[PDB]
Amino acid sequence: DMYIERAGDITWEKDAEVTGNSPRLDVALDESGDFSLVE
Amino acid sequence: GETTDGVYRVMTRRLLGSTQVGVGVMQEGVFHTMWHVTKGAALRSGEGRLDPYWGDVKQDLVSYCGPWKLDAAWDGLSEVQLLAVPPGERAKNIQTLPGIFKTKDGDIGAVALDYPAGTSGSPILDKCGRVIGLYGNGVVIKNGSYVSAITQGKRE
Numbered sequence: 001d002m003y004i005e006r007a008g009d010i011t012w013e014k015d016a017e018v019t020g021n022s023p024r025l026d027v028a029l030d031e032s033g034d035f036s037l038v039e
Numbered sequence: 040g041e042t043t044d045g046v047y048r049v050m051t052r053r054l055l056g057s058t059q060v061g062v063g064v065m066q067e068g069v070f071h072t073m074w075h076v077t078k079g080a081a082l083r084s085g086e087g088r089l090d091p092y093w094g095d096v097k098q099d100l101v102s103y104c105g106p107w108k109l110d111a112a113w114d115g116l117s118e119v120q121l122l123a124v125p126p127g128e129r130a131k132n133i134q135t136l137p138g139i140f141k142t143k144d145g146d147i148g149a150v151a152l153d154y155p156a157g158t159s160g161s162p163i164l165d166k167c168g169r170v171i172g173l174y175g176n177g178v179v180i181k182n183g184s185y186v187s188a189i190t191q192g193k194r195e
């Protein structure tokens with residue numbers, strides 16, 4: 001049996017660690033909700 | 040039980056110890072998470088019980104106690120914040136500019152941040168604090184890293 005525990009408020013935080021890139025990927029989504037790369 | 044708005048960890052005692060299987064958002068008395076986290080199973084909140092209300096395997100989303108309430112959308116150009124809630128670790132905001140998943144049915148935003156599978160359901164936010172989608176469903180690029188889609192439901 002699964003359960004839930006509070007982890008915090010949903011708020012935007014200024015001065016947060018800015019990381020990560022913005023790639024443009026060609027993808028397909030199947031009937032099982034799984035993404036895949038198209039090339 | 041506890042229905043206060045906020046981000047929650049989805050835990051299980053089925054495996055060894057207590058294992059975090061995912062994360063979810065509580066908003067307007069409805070718990071929102073990804074389908075692959077719970078598989079549509081009932082959840083527990085202290086003594087209370089949360090029953091599934093709506094779900095879909097293709098969208099990879101499920102709502103508890105009521106219909107999906109999250110309807111904010113990415114604007115196509117601004118930076119967003121992933122409010123990542125990792126297993127055994129404190130909730131943490133990571134600002135990023137999302138990329139694009141191009142599909143046969145249109146374009147979806149995509150955050151390129153790598154987190155453990157138990158982080159699935161962590162909400163992606165806009166500058167107003169509104170939940171624009173959930174992190175946890177995407178693809179594994181040539182690098183071995185994970186790039187998640189910004190998965191958003193539909194508000195009836």
Ligand SMILES: O=C(Nc1ccc2c(c1)CNC2)c1cc(Cl)ccc1-n1cncn1
Nearest residue numbers: 032033034075099155156158159175176185
């Ligand atoms: O497993 C993940 N996501 C997922 C799992 C099962 C299903 C779906 C998505 C949608 N249809 C069922 C995952 C999630 C995160 Cl946050 C980081 C990595 C991840 N992965 C690593 N390998 C592969 N996915």
